[PDB]
Design an enzyme around this catalytic site. Structure first.
Site, short mmCIF file in Angstrom:
data_model
loop_
_atom_site.label_atom_id
_atom_site.label_comp_id
_atom_site.label_asym_id
_atom_site.label_seq_id
_atom_site.Cartn_x
_atom_site.Cartn_y
_atom_site.Cartn_z
N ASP A 192 0.82 -1.22 0.00
CA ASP A 192 0.00 0.00 0.00
C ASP A 192 0.86 1.27 0.00
O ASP A 192 1.30 1.72 1.06
CB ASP A 192 -0.96 -0.01 1.20
CG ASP A 192 -1.85 1.22 1.22
OD1 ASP A 192 -1.97 1.86 0.16
OD2 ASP A 192 -2.44 1.54 2.28
N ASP A 196 -1.31 5.61 -5.36
CA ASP A 196 -1.83 4.79 -4.27
C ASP A 196 -2.09 3.35 -4.73
O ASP A 196 -3.18 3.04 -5.24
CB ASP A 196 -3.11 5.43 -3.74
CG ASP A 196 -3.65 4.77 -2.50
OD1 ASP A 196 -3.13 3.72 -2.08
OD2 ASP A 196 -4.60 5.33 -1.94
C1 LIG Z 1 -4.40 5.89 6.34
C2 LIG Z 1 -4.46 7.30 5.86
C3 LIG Z 1 -3.06 7.78 5.51
C4 LIG Z 1 -5.41 7.45 4.70
C5 LIG Z 1 -6.72 7.85 4.91
C6 LIG Z 1 -7.60 7.97 3.83
C7 LIG Z 1 -7.16 7.70 2.54
C8 LIG Z 1 -5.85 7.30 2.31
C9 LIG Z 1 -5.37 6.99 0.90
N1 LIG Z 1 -4.90 5.60 0.74
C10 LIG Z 1 -6.00 4.60 0.92
C11 LIG Z 1 -5.42 3.20 1.14
O1 LIG Z 1 -4.45 3.25 2.19
C12 LIG Z 1 -6.48 2.15 1.50
C13 LIG Z 1 -5.79 0.82 1.84
C14 LIG Z 1 -6.70 -0.38 1.94
C15 LIG Z 1 -7.67 -0.47 2.94
C16 LIG Z 1 -8.49 -1.59 3.03
C17 LIG Z 1 -8.35 -2.63 2.13
C18 LIG Z 1 -7.38 -2.54 1.14
C19 LIG Z 1 -6.56 -1.43 1.05
O2 LIG Z 1 -7.08 -3.48 0.19
C20 LIG Z 1 -8.13 -4.23 -0.35
C21 LIG Z 1 -8.03 -4.11 -1.83
C22 LIG Z 1 -9.17 -3.33 -2.36
C23 LIG Z 1 -8.95 -1.85 -2.27
C24 LIG Z 1 -10.26 -1.07 -2.32
C25 LIG Z 1 -9.98 0.39 -2.15
O3 LIG Z 1 -9.82 1.10 -3.13
N2 LIG Z 1 -9.89 0.88 -0.89
C26 LIG Z 1 -10.09 0.09 0.32
C27 LIG Z 1 -9.60 2.31 -0.74
C28 LIG Z 1 -10.87 3.15 -0.63
C29 LIG Z 1 -8.65 2.56 0.45
O4 LIG Z 1 -9.00 3.29 1.38
N3 LIG Z 1 -7.45 1.96 0.41
C30 LIG Z 1 -5.00 7.17 3.40
#
Ligand SMILES: CC(C)c1cccc(CNC[C@@H](O)[C@@H]2Cc3cccc(c3)OCCCCCC(=O)N(C)[C@@H](C)C(=O)N2)c1
Length: 377
Positions: free
Chosen positions: A35, A220
């Site tokens: 990630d 990301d």
């Molecule tokens: C923690 C802080 C620094 C922060 C807050 C808000 C946003 C960010 C930006 N980065 C987001 C990532 O860090 C995250 C990882 C994450 C969380 C949960 C599951 C994950 C990956 O894999 C499963 C694969 C499918 C991915 C689906 C998807 O697209 N997601 C689940 C996005 C919506 C997301 O939220 N992914 C960072």
């Protein structure tokens, strides 16, 4: 010796890319999500319905408790747990072991995915966005400080059930073709970049380039979709809708909910436009562009009914926290996170997405005036 890391990533479509790791003494093997959108290294450390294994601190003679709690809220999903340290290795990685911070996940909500095959997450971004605060050193910072691994890594995310490579410490030239094009890391927190122009099928969206980076743009690997600020999302969808109007899609399709289907092998790729993202370059008034094929933003998904038709989900969604260049954007490119030189490189991947008449590309140089004005403040 980077050949040892080629093809060290696996995953299921839309469930993230993961690398194998070991934590503790004796080593406990776990699959860890890669990630670049966060900065915490965390693993399941308590039973969970979707976990087939988890980190057992009691069984590790090198485990050290930090006597501090931690929680991370993502865009979707969150967890909480207990901070500690332990010895960590990457079997198909550099031949090193480091003592690293580890958040032992004791409770979670909509975080782990049923049948994803991974049990933890490796946040590869900078300390500035680590929880609970920037004093908790991220994994990659510890690796670089404790070993001779150079301060950079590269990601080759491949489409189709999915695989790829994470080259820790360098660039493997067998993973890409053509030239690498570099964009500055604007600020070391997320991997923040500046988008200076957007075109769809060669037509400029003609928006204030600040809209593209409101309130930031990040690279990301932990986000599946390309996420766009509201105003940019609306303009992109309108343009993509018009280009494909000869076919009708449910309105829920454009929201990432409903999935469109066609007879096996008859998907009309030609009616979906290519998206060109221009990124700030390394020299004055110079940018470069990466071009995204519809096979990247139409993610293929298992046919809910009788698996007799090719079905897809619209992999572009609306954002309220800036642009996210997610996994579907990175797929088919070789992306170099050159932390040492505060830049991110892009090149056509060796596992590039195949269209018959069009091709994903990384092209430059372009002249773009006033690129500095595209950054949001
Ligand atoms: C923690 C802080 C620094 C922060 C807050 C808000 C946003 C960010 C930006 N980065 C987001 C990532 O860090 C995250 C990882 C994450 C969380 C949960 C599951 C994950 C990956 O894999 C499963 C694969 C499918 C991915 C689906 C998807 O697209 N997601 C689940 C996005 C919506 C997301 O939220 N992914 C960072």
């Amino acid at each position: 010796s980077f050949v040892e890391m080629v093809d060290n990533l696996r995953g299921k479509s839309g469930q993230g890319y993961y690398v194998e790791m070991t934590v503790g003494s004796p080593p406990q093997t776990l699959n860890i999500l890669v990630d670049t959108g966060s900065s915490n290294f965390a693993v399941g450390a308590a039973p969970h319905p979707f976990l087939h294994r988890y980190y057992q601190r009691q069984l590790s003679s090198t485990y050290r408790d930090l006597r501090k709690g931690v929680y991370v809220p993502y865009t979707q999903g969150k967890w909480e747990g207990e901070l500690g340290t332990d010895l960590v290795s990457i079997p198909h990685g550099p031949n090193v072991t480091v003592r690293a911070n580890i958040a032992a996940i004791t409770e979670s909500d909509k975080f782990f995915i049923n049948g994803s095959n991974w049990e933890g997450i490796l946040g590869l971004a900078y300390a500035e966005i680590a929880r609970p605060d920037d004093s908790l050193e991220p994994f990659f910072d510890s690796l670089v400080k404790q070993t001779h691994v150079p301060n950079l890594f590269s990601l080759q995310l491949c489409g189709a059930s999915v695989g790829g490579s994470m080259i820790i410490g360098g660039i493997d030239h067998s993973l890409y073709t053509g030239s690498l094009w570099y964009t500055p890391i604007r600020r070391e927190w997320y991997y923040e970049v500046i988008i200076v122009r957007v075109e769809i099928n060669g037509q400029d969206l003609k928006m204030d380039c600040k809209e593209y980076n409101y309130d930031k743009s990040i690279v990301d690997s932990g986000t599946t979709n390309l996420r766009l600020p509201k105003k940019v999302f609306e303009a992109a969808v309108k343009s993509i809708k018009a280009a494909s109007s000869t076919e009708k899609f449910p309105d829920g399709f454009w929201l990432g909910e409903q999935l469109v289907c066609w007879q096996a092998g008859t998907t009309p790729w030609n009616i979906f436009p290519v998206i060109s993202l221009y990124l700030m370059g390394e020299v004055t008034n110079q940018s470069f562009r990466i071009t995204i094929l519809p096979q990247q933003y139409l993610r293929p998904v298992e046919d809910v009914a009788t698996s007799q038709d090719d079905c897809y989900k619209f992999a572009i969604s609306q954002s309220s926290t800036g642009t996210v260049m997610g996994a579907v954007i990175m797929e088919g490119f070789y992306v170099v996170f050159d932390r040492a030189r505060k830049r991110i490189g892009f090149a056509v991947s060796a596992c590039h997405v195949h269209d018959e008449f069009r091709t994903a590309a990384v092209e430059g140089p372009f002249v773009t005036l006033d690129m500095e004005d595209c950054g949001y403040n």
